[PDB]
Nucleic acid binder design. Structure first.
Ligand SMILES: [Mg+2]
Length: 1544
RNA sequence: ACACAGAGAC
RNA sequence: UGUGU
């Protein structure tokens, strides 16, 4: 075709301006692939292009019909000249300076007239990923940047425009304004070019361009292994369950029974039709209202049935005295900062009022007499410890034991009551009435409980009421910290968004959370302050007059705390009945001995930031601007109260009611002829009720179930869009918009992620593992050997699987062309041969379970601990193997000799069951996974290995429908979920699915690799068996408990366990994530069958016409969607067409078991303009993501050791809130809460010397020492920590510190070592690492830059890997979070930091004053070359900085926002130092560096680089994708600042 | 109190 | 108990 059309309408805009990358992908459908027979020889390629199949789309019209012959020496670029067929001199274009960059010609150089040259360059990418597609375009720009950049400017009136054409089968990228149909024409021609290239390369050699030596050797190793490796198929058939190879030959060779598939599909269609008529009441004829009332009656009946069922199991008690909140409603006025405990008076009257009064009278009396130490705290001596040198002598060791410990010598009755309250409950465990309380504890509550205090508290309370404290010690400190942090950016629109934060910090809820968080931090600090029997710890909160008596429990775990405060010392209280009762003892108000576990304190430490983020978010969602002041509404109070009660309770069951409200409230989008069926959720609401808030949430959940069944959300099409009406809060029941209803479903994510792994909740994991195993079919006849037409559980149909695999093969060959197996083979061999054994060497976990651990008698003495993968990898390297290809054989031999898999188990938790396998089984698993990943990337509609496809497939479906149907097409969708995915797939299925898509070479390896899954030996926890066998009691109420006890003791034998064995056995079912890319391939095959079947059904019509429709599918691993868009010919035809589509989508629920897939009841079927995929809701043109999901995780206690990486993690979590739909103002508020959290973790409420710390930090503001940097509020979150550090370097005295650190030196950062030290030491001696490793780095310094040549530099690569600063934090598990919380009492004063150096240790105050000591020596500022070297995005950093200057005054207008919120990506923002000079043109770049000497070794000290490894670590040193209206950086700040607000 | 249709914990 | 003299 002509070229001026392509180079036409484009404007020039002066010159020296490129075009933004516009990504185009194959939205449209192609007619097909013609015949491309290729004839060898005649020193050239002689192709025979057949006639293109004609289509109504006319896409394939520019193909060359006939024969074209191109000679050799060009077939190495056959793609280049072929896909651009039909589409000079550089000195001809412009005068030449003869600088040497001449003689290279662009593909198209023609000027196109009009005075602008419009030089364009052509490129091709065979790699099927975005990465190579972008890299080719970038490198084309790089290698033709120079002429356009400078050579053009020297001539009169320059006019140029550079273009790059990059084509791939997946998509095409160009800055050129390019026609859509032209884009798919280019991709089509590229597909023919790829087919021709593969046939030419397969026919003969030397067509392919010479590659690197390492890739050829990598292919050679893999080919030799796959040709040579033998698995001894007889032994793997005999040892494991049904694994005969004959299954593979029968599956691959025998065609599917087309008569069976046709008959089975019709029967399942009839069954689905009957079920749809019966469940949705469609026959006989009834109006919509009558069926809606019938659905209402059935939902009400099922609700009352559930209530009556839960009532009978419960104790029939009308009212209970339990309080939802286990903390007092106290709101004491903050006082001067002091942890001192003073006697005062009035403790004499405490004796009479109860046992708690007796304890609180004995406690304060010891303070008066001075027996207890630490009642007075003097920071003057502690300040000396921080600043003194030689700190081993100065620190008092003996002060730890007796710090604030008192013995009350208490009476008997008080001890009895405390034993009733759990304190010292082992001494008087049995006694009297203790067993009565214990048996009363295990009582399920009744659903008809009088839970009306919760409803009154949520609607009416004093939350979000200004406490009128305003200027008090904690808030003064927070305000000072905020005002110091906002200094480099101190302007207006910072004050406006800081005053809102201070107003939100002065509410009753936030002050209450503040002192509760102080209490939680003090209890975390008291965890390791162990006491003897009868010894308690008095403490006092730094800013509040609250005294706490702590009884630490041995081995951490629980903590016992009793609060006390003078009656005159409580200014205000929270107005609610949800709080627990408090003992009134004269002038003192007391509290019972409540209990919190070691992980319950983490939820209370983050309470103030949680409340602040909830207030800011739910003020944003109601439209109230931060700078405005208004009284809270009903919705605001109810949402904050729900968040408050959820965060304080911290129970897993309570979240499950609100978590499951999503699946019962999404059913209101179900269009007719189907009725909403929200009563599917009742199966998951059978859990026992153990708290009044659970009762209230269940009662409010069932009322939401009646409303959804009664009435669905009406479409209400107003103009060019659909806006659903009738949306309402699930628990509150109050009407609201769509986003609030969606966001309310994620309120339950306010619970802490990790709760515990106790031996009571660990039992139900094995219930999940076993109950599916017991459903194994008796005969293996239906396990892949034949067809069933009615599969039971664990069974599938072979013919249906073959039909799905054939459909996926056809759809892959459609886009990828023929000979797709050749490219897949080459990619697999390349990616297997290149990888070395040390690449896999990273510590995640392994399992030491073996044959020696299979008997419980020999293991009772020992304790089970699991090693890391690095130890096994180092053992393998010491054996001699360095390549991954030389491995795998030994691992498979070991697994076959063992005959099973050795797996251990964790519980963990999600907002879960994970499996850790042995090192031998992991390598073979890694191999079978790296096959499946390369296989599934060819799939056109999965998202697990093609992450771009998630937000591509759903929106591009409308673009297909626009041409294939025209305007007015009706879209019907179906959000799908799968039940029992991990437990329900027999492993023969995945083996056949994977072996379908490979050459015959890999079939033996795959069969051997995943034939081992059919016999698993999973190790249970050792402590579980101790308590299972020690009692030896058959008494139980849950049958699984008795079954597991019987299996262990061997009274009756079962298949899933044996007598006296530590492991449990499981044949049926894969595992979570261990088989992730193969099950995704299976589930892609299943819904590639579904799309073709739906297309055929739509083509055949409903009695013989052609119902025009478009079917599109997306399925990553488990979540999946089916989008069908149709157009009705007539208005009467519309109802019949929609009924046909409803029948088509309802048939899926019955067609899934044919492939051995069980459709869950969480799947929402037959919705119009509503589709959901991976928690991302697509409501027509209004994409909705839960912002509440990401702001609740924005403040996480960081286990990192740098203390400068804490702010990096905070920025990383801040960016995730911005991408979730949060505005810039809300993101700035989240950052202020993150600052509050950061300074809480540094000792705001735990260290008396924190005021001196902030005073010294104000003088020297610097990260890596405890200073927080804040983003610009206009662009908060969109800029990373580097931009903030660059702005600080340019705008404050930190530039002096960096200038002396780098510019003026001839010859930084801190580590803190979270976690213990002896286990790291016990790790190193086990390794084979040489003790002299550091000085072997000096000679041959290429070890740190070249990955692997010989074996000698191995274990040195591993040593420099393990000695990375980030590795040390990886040794620490999740148990170091309480240590990070408790460390705030000694970070500033005591010496825990090292200067990144074991000889020297320094405190934070000492390091800060050494920075002050290092002052007055810093000379100059940042050299402009330093600003480019340290910050290689400095130029566009400045460009963003200028673009943020005009947004300085809060001036704007309130305009109604259009609801067309879609995803929008913003494209904003030293290897040559190694590859040249040091190791084997552009040599002036080293001269441009202008430092150091030209010698790899010695070179004295250019900087503080004492070792070459440290230099390598130093030399190792963002396209944030927002969500808003579709329209650019200036406009984003203009638009996405507040919903409905425009910032001028 | 703590988890839990008692197999823990204190 | 890098524990708050
Ligand atoms: Mg889903």
């Amino acid at each position: 075709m002509n070229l001026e059309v392509l180079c036409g309408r484009i404007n020039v805009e002066n010159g020296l301006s490129l075009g933004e990358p516009g990504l185009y992908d194959q939205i449209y459908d192609r007619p097909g692939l013609p015949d491309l027979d290729v004839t060898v020889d005649a020193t050239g390629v002689t192709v025979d292009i057949g006639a293109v199949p004609d289509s109504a789309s006319q896409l394939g019209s520019s193909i060359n019909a006939g024969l074209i012959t191109i000679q050799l020496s060009e077939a190495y670029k056959i793609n280049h000249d072929f896909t651009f067929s039909g589409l000079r001199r550089l000195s001809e274009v412009f005068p030449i300076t003869h600088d040497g960059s001449d003689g290279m010609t662009p593909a198209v150089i023609h000027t196109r007239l009009d005075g602008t040259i419009v030089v364009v360059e052509f490129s091709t990418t065979r790699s099927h990923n975005i990465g190579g597609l972008e890299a080719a375009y970038r490198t084309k720009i790089e290698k033709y940047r120079d002429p356009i950049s400078r050579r053009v400017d020297i001539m009169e009136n320059p006019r140029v425009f550079f273009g790059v054409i990059v084509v791939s089968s997946g998509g095409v990228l160009s800055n050129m304004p390019l026609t859509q149909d032209e884009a798919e024409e280019l991709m089509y021609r590229f597909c023919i070019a790829n087919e021709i290239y593969t046939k030419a390369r397969s026919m003969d050699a030397d067509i392919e361009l010479q590659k690197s030596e390492e890739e050829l050797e990598a292919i050679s190793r893999a080919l030799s292994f796959f040709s040579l490796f033998e698995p001894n198929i007889e032994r793997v058939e005999g040892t494991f369950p049904n694994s005969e190879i004959k299954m593979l030959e029968q599956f691959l060779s025998t065609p599917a029974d087309v008569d069976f598939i046709t008959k089975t599909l019709k029967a399942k269609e009839v069954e689905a039709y009957a079920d749809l008529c019966d469940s949705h009441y469609l026959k006989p004829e009834k109006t919509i209202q009558e069926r809606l009332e019938i659905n209402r009656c059935e939902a009400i009946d099922k609700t009352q049935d559930l209530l009556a069922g839960l009532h009978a199991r419960s104790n029939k008690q009308t009212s209970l005295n339990r309080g939802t909140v286990k903390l007092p409603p106290w709101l004491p006025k903050p006082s001067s900062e002091s942890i001192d405990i003073k006697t005062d008076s009035g403790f004499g009257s405490l004796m009479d009022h109860g046992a708690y009064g007796e304890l609180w009278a004995k406690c304060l009396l010891d303070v008066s007499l001075g027996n207890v130490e630490g009642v007075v705290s003097d920071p003057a001596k502690e300040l000396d410890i921080a600043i003194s040198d030689d700190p081993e002598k100065d620190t008092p060791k003996e002060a730890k034991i007796t710090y604030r410990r008192f013995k009350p010598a208490l009476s008997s009755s008080a001890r009895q009551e405390f034993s009733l309250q759990g304190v010292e409950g082992k001494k008087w465990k049995r006694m009297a009435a203790n067993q009565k309380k214990e048996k009363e504890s295990h009582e399920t509550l009744s659903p008809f409980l009088d839970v009306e205090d919760i409803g009154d508290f949520l609607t009416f309370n004093n939350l979000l009421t200004d406490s009128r404290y305003g200027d008090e010690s904690i808030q003064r400190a927070v305000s000072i910290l905020l005002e110091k942090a906002s200094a480099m950016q101190d302007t207006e629109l910072t004050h406006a968004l800081n005053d809102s934060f201070k107003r939100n910090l002065s509410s009753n809820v936030v002050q209450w959370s503040l002192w509760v968080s102080c209490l939680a931090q003090e209890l975390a600090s008291a965890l390791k302050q162990h006491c003897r029997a009868g010894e308690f710890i008095i403490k006092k909160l730094k800013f509040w007059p609250i005294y706490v008596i702590i009884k630490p429990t041995k081995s951490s775990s629980h903590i016992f705390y009793s609060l006390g405060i003078r009656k005159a010392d409580v200014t205000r209280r929270l107005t609610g009945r949800v709080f627990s009762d408090t003992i009134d003892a004269g002038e003192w108000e007391l509290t019972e001995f409540k209990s919190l576990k070691t992980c319950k304190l983490t939820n209370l430490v983050n309470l103030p930031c949680t409340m602040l983020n909830s207030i800011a978010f739910w003020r944003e969602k109601l439209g109230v601007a931060p700078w405005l002041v208004r009284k809270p509404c009903s919705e605001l109070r109810e949402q904050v109260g729900l968040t408050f009660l959820i965060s304080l309770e911290d129970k897993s069951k309570t979240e499950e009611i609100i978590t499951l409200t999503r699946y019962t409230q999404m059913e209101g989008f179900v269009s007719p002829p189907m009725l909403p069926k929200p009563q599917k959720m009742l199966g998951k609401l059978d859990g026992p009720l153990r708290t009044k808030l659970q009762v209230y949430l269940l009662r409010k959940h069932l009322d939401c179930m009646v409303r959804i069944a009664s009435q669905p959300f009406s479409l209400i099409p107003r103009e060019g869009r659909v806006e659903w009406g009738g949306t309402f809060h699930a628990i509150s029941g109050r009407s609201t918009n769509l986003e609030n209803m969606v966001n309310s479903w994620y309120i339950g994510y306010y619970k802490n992620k990790e709760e515990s792994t106790e031996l009571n909740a660990l039992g139900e994991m094995y219930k999940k593992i076993v109950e599916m195993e017991e459903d194994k079919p008796s005969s293996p006849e239906f396990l892949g050997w034949g067809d069933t037409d009615s599969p039971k559980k664990h069974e599938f149909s072979r013919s249906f699987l073959r039909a799905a695999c054939s459909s996926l093969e056809r759809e892959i060959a459609q886009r990828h062309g023929r000979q797709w197996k050749q490219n897949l083979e080459e990619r697999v061999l390349r990616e297997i041969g290149t990888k070395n054994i040390l690449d896999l060497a990273s510590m995640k976990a392994t399992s030491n379970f073996s044959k020696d651990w299979e008997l419980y008698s020999e293991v009772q003495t020992k304790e089970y601990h699991r090693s890391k993968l690095l130890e096994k990898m180092a053992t393998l390297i010491e054996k001699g193997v360095m390549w991954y290809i030389d491995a795998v054989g030994q691992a498979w031999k070991a697994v076959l000799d063992d005959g099973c898999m050795r797996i251990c188990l964790f519980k963990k938790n999600q907002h879960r069951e994970i499996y850790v396998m042995d090192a031998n089984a992991r390598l073979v698993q890694f191999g079978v996974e790296t096959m499946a990943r390369c296989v599934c990337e060819l799939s056109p509609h999965e998202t697990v290995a093609n992450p771009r496809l998630k937000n591509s497939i759903i929106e591009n479906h409308g673009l297909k429908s626009a041409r294939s149907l025209g305007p007015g097409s009706i879209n019907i969708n179906s959000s799908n979920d799968a039940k029992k995915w991990n437990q329900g797939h027999y492993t023969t299925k995945l083996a056949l699915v994977l072996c379908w898509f490979m050459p015959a070479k890999f079939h033996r390896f795959i069969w051997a690799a995943i034939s081992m899954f059919r016999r698993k030996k999973m190790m249970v926890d050792l402590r579980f068996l101790a308590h299972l066998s020690s009692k030896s009691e058959s008494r139980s109420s849950d049958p699984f408990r008795e079954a597991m006890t019987d299996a262990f003791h061997g009274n009756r034998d079962v298949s899933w366990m044996d007598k006296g064995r530590t492991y449990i056995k499981t044949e049926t079912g894969m595992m979570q994530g261990i088989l992730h890319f193969t099950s995704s391939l299976l589930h892609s095959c299943v819904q590639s069958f579904y799309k073709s079947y739906f297309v055929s059904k739509l083509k055949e019509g409903y009695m013989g016409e052609s119902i025009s429709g478009v079917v599109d599918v997306i399925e990553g691993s488990d979540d999946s969607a089916i989008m069908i868009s149709i157009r009705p010919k007539s208005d009467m035809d519309e109802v019949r067409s929609r009924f046909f589509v409803a029948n088509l989508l309802h048939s899926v629920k019955f067609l899934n078991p044919l492939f051995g897939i069980y459709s869950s009841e969480k799947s929402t079927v037959n919705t119009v303009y509503c589709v959901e995929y991976n928690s991302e809701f697509h409501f027509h043109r209004h994409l909705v993501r839960p912002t509440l999901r990401w702001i609740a995780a924005s403040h996480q206690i960081s286990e990192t050791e740098a203390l400068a990486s804490r702010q990096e993690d905070y920025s990383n979590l801040l960016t995730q809130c911005l991408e979730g739909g949060a505005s810039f103002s809300l993101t700035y508020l989240i950052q202020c809460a993150q600052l509050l959290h950061h300074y809480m973790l540094l000792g705001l409420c735990l260290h008396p010397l924190f005021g001196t710390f902030m005073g010294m930090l104000i003088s020297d503001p610097d990260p890596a020492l405890g200073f927080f940097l804040m983003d610009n509020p206009a662009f908060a979150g969109g800029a990373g920590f580097r931009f903030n550090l660059w702005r600080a370097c340019k705008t404050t005295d930190l530039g002096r510190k960096y200038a002396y650190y780098f510019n003026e030196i001839q010859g930084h950062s801190v580590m803190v070592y979270w976690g213990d030290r002896k286990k790291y030491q016990a790790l190193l001696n086990r390794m084979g690492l040489p003790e002299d490793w550091v000085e072997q780095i000096d000679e041959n310094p290429g070890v740190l830059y070249r990955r692997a040549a010989n074996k000698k530099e191995l274990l040195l690569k591993l040593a420099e890997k393990v000695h990375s600063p980030g590795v040390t934090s990886s040794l620490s598990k999740g148990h170091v979070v309480p240590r990070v919380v408790a460390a705030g009492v000694y970070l500033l004063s005591r010496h825990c930091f090292r200067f990144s150096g074991s000889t020297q240790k320094a405190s934070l105050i000492k390091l800060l004053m050494m920075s002050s000591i290092s002052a007055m020596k810093h000379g100059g500022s940042l050299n402009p070359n330093q600003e480019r070297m340290l910050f290689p995005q400095a130029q566009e950093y400045d460009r963003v900085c200028t673009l943020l200057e005009e947004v300085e005054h809060l001036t704007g207008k309130f305009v109604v926002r259009e609801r067309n919120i879609v995803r929008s990506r913003i494209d904003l923002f030293a290897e040559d130092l190694v590859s040249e000079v040091w190791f084997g043109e552009w040599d002036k770049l080293r001269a441009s560096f202008a430092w150091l000497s030209t010698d790899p070794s010695e070179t004295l000290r250019d900087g503080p680089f004492l070792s070459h490894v440290q230099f390598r670590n130093f030399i190792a040193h963002r396209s944030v994708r927002l969500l808003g209206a579709p329209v650019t950086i200036s406009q984003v700040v203009r638009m996405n600042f507040f919903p409905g607000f425009s910032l001028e």
